[PDB]
Amino acid sequence: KVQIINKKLDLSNVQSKCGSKDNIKHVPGGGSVQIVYKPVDLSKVTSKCGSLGNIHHKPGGGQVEVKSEKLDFKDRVQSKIGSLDNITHVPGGGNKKIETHKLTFRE
Amino acid sequence: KVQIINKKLDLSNVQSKCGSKDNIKHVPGGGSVQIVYKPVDLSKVTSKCGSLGNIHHKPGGGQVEVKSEKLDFKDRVQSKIGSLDNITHVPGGGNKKIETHKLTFRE
Amino acid sequence: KVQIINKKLDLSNVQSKCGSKDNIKHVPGGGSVQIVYKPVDLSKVTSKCGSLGNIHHKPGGGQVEVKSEKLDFKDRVQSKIGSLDNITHVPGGGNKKIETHKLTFRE
Numbered sequence: 613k614v615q616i617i618n619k620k621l622d623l624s625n626v627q628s629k630c631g632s633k634d635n636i637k638h639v640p641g642g643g644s645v646q647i648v649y650k651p652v653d654l655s656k657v658t659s660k661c662g663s664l665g666n667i668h669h670k671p672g673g674g675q676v677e678v679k680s681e682k683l684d685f686k687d688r689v690q691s692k693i694g695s696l697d698n699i700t701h702v703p704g705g706g707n708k709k710i711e712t713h714k715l716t717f718r719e
Numbered sequence: 720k721v722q723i724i725n726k727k728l729d730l731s732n733v734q735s736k737c738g739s740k741d742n743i744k745h746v747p748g749g750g751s752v753q754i755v756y757k758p759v760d761l762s763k764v765t766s767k768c769g770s771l772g773n774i775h776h777k778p779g780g781g782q783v784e785v786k787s788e789k790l791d792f793k794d795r796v797q798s799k800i801g802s803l804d805n806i807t808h809v810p811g812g813g814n815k816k817i818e819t820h821k822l823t824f825r826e
Numbered sequence: 827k828v829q830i831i832n833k834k835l836d837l838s839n840v841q842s843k844c845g846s847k848d849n850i851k852h853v854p855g856g857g858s859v860q861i862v863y864k865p866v867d868l869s870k871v872t873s874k875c876g877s878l879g880n881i882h883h884k885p886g887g888g889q890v891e892v893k894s895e896k897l898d899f900k901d902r903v904q905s906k907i908g909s910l911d912n913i914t915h916v917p918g919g920g921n922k923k924i925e926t927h928k929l930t931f932r933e
Binding site: 613614615616617618619620621622623624625626627628629630631632633634635636637638639640641642643644645646647648649650651652653654655656657658659660661662663664665666667668669670671672673674675676677678679680681682683684685686687688689690691692693694695696697698699700701702703704705706707708709710711712713714715716717718719 | 720721722723724725726727728729730731732733734735736737738739740741742743744745746747748749750751752753754755756757758759760761762763764765766767768769770771772773774775776777778779780781782783784785786787788789790791792793794795796797798799800801802803804805806807808809810811812813814815816817818819820821822823824825826
């Protein structure tokens with residue numbers, strides 16, 4: 613009766629880089645709406661019920677409401693732009709990622 | 720009775736780079752709506768019920784509502800643009816990704 | 827009866843870099859609304875009920891409400907821009923990530 617087990621994950625939710633490295637840029641001249649909706653939502657619902665069990669699982673969702681009624685721009689909207697986002701994203705390293713995962717079993 | 724098991728994942732939800740490396744750019748002259756809807760949604764619903772069990776699983780979804788009523792631009796909308804997004808994304812590294820996954824079993 | 831187990835995760839929710847490395851930039855000339863909605867939401871709901879058990883799980887969701895009624899820009903909206911975001915994101919290190927995960931079992 614020699615029992616030997618190596619096991620990584622049995623019941624797991626792994627979420628990496630969720631809503632990540634994000635640039636949201638707005639240059640309105642006039643009358644502009646920008647909307648960004650990033651729900652990162654995670655649920656383990658384990659449920660045991662019965663016998664007239666009245667379960668009402670109701671996660672209210674998000675709401676966005678916009679009402680513009682009176683908007684007038686009588687004369688002038690002018691946008692003179694030179695330069696957005698001068699980005700040198702320079703990864704210059706000759707990196708070494710050594711990832712040892714070694715599995716020795718002598719029975 | 721020599722039992723030996725190596726096993727990585729049995730019940731797993733892995734989510735990598737979800738909604739990732741994202742650029743959202745708006746240059747409205749006049750009267751513009753930009754909408755971005757990134758729900759990253761994850762559920763393990765384990766349910767055991769019965770016997771008049773009345774289950775009401777209702778995750779409200781997201782809502783977006785836009786109402787513009789009065790909008791006038793009587794004279795001038797002008798957009799003179801030189802340069803957006805001067806991006807040198809320079810990965811210059813001769814990287815080494817060493818990934819050892821070795822499986823030794825001597826029975 | 828020799829029982830030996832190595833096991834990493836059984837019941838786990840891991841969330842790394844969630845809503846991460848985020849730039850939100852607004853340059854309105856006139857009359858602009860910017861909306862960003864990042865809910866990072868995590869739930870382990872373990873439920874055992876019954877027998878006229880009336881469960882009302884109701885997480886109110888977020889609400890966004892915008893009402894503009896009187897908006898007039900009689901004469902002039904002018905936006906002269908030179909430079910946004912001069913970003914040298916310079917990772918210059920030849921980094922070494924040594925990740926030893928070694929699995930020795932002598933039975």
